[PDB]
Subunit: 110 residues, 2 copies
């Protein structure tokens, strides 16, 4: 059948996938020639990359809350400290705030 | 046709990359036709995947580094807590350990 046009369409599509559009539609998947073989392989790569990305992102979504929990616990603990140790309690609170800043300004974006 | 083999071979290349094999050599880069363009793009992706992996490694390392400083200040601070606040120092130390655990499981 036709060769150069489907090859170009698959190349353009692949460019879209490679640069991060993992939702790009792969054409020519049903072809009974080598163009079809290529298209199926490209679709498999697309699905592979999408799987990687989704797994990683799901994992990432848990990190902020998972750090925030023990940090919050530290705060609760300082709130129980002896009134003689207001200084230490406050110092620790400032460190906690630094950690939270790292979570909000950076980790939340991962 | 004469380009059937190069196309099938590139399909094999795509399949190797999809399987996580980023070390396999991409063939047919040394041509100036459409096949060559595709092959070059595939190679660029392979290299990019490797680079991005490394970049992520260093990224997470940096995150761990940034947290370790204030976390360490807190850990050292607990040593100055009073005897009657010992249960609190222990609780906070355990919290810090939990943070660290989350971080390292994140690293891994």
């Amino acid at each position: 059948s036709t060769i150069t046009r489907p090859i170009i369409e698959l190349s353009n599509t692949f460019d879209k996938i490679a640069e991060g559009n993992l939702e790009a539609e792969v054409p020519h998947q049903n072809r009974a020639d080598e163009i079809g073989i290529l298209a199926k392989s490209i679709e498999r790569l697309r699905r592979s990359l999408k799987q990687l990305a989704d797994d990683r992102t799901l994992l990432m979504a848990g990190v902020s809350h998972d750090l925030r929990t023990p940090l919050t616990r530290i705060r609760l603990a300082t709130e129980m400290m002896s009134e003689q140790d207001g200084y230490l309690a406050e110092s620790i609170n400032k460190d906690i705030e630094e950690c939270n800043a790292i979570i909000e300004q950076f980790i939340d974006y991962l």
